[PDB]
Paper text:
In response, one family of large bacteriophages uses a nucleus-like compartment to protect its replicating genomes by excluding host defence factors. Here we find that the bacteriophage nuclear shell assembles primarily from one protein, which we name [name] (ChmA). Combining cryo-electron tomography of nuclear shells in bacteriophage-infected cells and cryo-electron microscopy of a minimal [name] compartment in vitro, we show that [name] self-assembles as a flexible sheet into closed micrometre-scale compartments. We find that the shell is primarily composed of a single protein, [name], which self-assembles through its extended N and C termini into a closed compartment.
Author numbering:
A (entry chain C): 591 to 615
B (entry chain A): 64 to 586
C (entry chain B): 45 to 63
D (entry chain D): 626 to 631
């Protein structure tokens, strides 16, 4: 067979919305 | 004699306050009940209408007893011996005996109703000089009982719950600390917990006229970073792997993973699932602020050769290399460039759920939401389970009803990995006790031979292996590595979240008027 | 609002007491 | 089993 976990790659969180951060001034 | 001392200390502490008659203590011992260990039960009641409702907290004491032996099981090839711990002896008979004792304590079935609100095992001896531990246990039991009462009867008793609307007139902040040398965090019993990354969420206050500055700390979270083997197959005539719509170098074969180990309040008196959701939101927001999670590996690389050296990946990168590389003389950007060639630019969010402990009652909701649909016959639309409903309701209530508009009802929220993780501690060479969870993939790469690494990864990844086989393999590897000088205390299970659900939750929190300003992020 | 959260969501036994 | 104990 083939070693490794294939489902773990698809569950990664890449980026989130930028509106959660407080705006300067 | 452990039950008597603990009960005496609790009663002595309570004798001076105004809550003398609010608690009932029940002692259960094997000489009259079918229980494996001596236990103490702390009970409290609440009255709605003309009915009484009682809730109890169970505290078995196992200090001074012999450890459990191994059990022989049935396998595909033959018979295997599986290790066991204290929690394995708490079956339905124990629950029935505890319920019978609780009912006998209050007077009978006609005097009210009784339910179990939590369970925690105490592995340390209790003497006549342990007032602090007794006070902490009493506080934890009271918090659990009050939270259960609120959850069950808030609508009838008019008891509110935390939500993001109470932080509208203030400025939340966050901070992160990377520490890996010295003592670690401790639990209520006093056992070490791995605390490689610590995140604190606070609130900023300024006086209107006097211009004074102060802050209020709410909750804290601890965890660490692990690695998972996940090679990419280009030879199957498939498209290239895209992360955030960007291709990756062909040499990347490892996926970073974040594991949460604990969460506790700092100045808040009550800890509810809503507070846990707030802490999770804060941790997610902080950890993604400019790739701040790689700072842990960058800092770990500054120590040089050691069990946590990230330079062991040089052997993966080049087969000719046979020794870990030393990166203590490289700049931060050089280390980042080196890491970019072997690691995926993404993070996996996971959590360890203990089978028993101080906050197991709170954290048991995550496993309950893994099963979405009950197989009951339906007229038109399939029925949805109760744990999923509870988790969805908590998520929607924290964000004031925006999660429902952002996320579709019925989509997955939690996945199960199927790995059972042991809990314990061992003696470190620096004179302190360290968490048994220090043994990970990097430790095997830096300390052991590639065969052990392959066996560890196969045990963590193979799908044609039962739970007992994986447990036996990991136990054998740990015993061989540590020469048998360690102690086990319990079990834990690992679950991970859905990234789409997390993104929807972040968007809903942003849409509710909640913002956070990290204060410690560098570069 | 956040200043008196312990009054709104109170518990009988508190871990911290102060001097 | 512990999660469904009580």
């Amino acid at each position: 067979a083939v070693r490794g976990n294939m489902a773990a790659r698809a569950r990664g969180l890449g980026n989130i919305s930028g509106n959660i951060y407080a705006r300067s001034d």
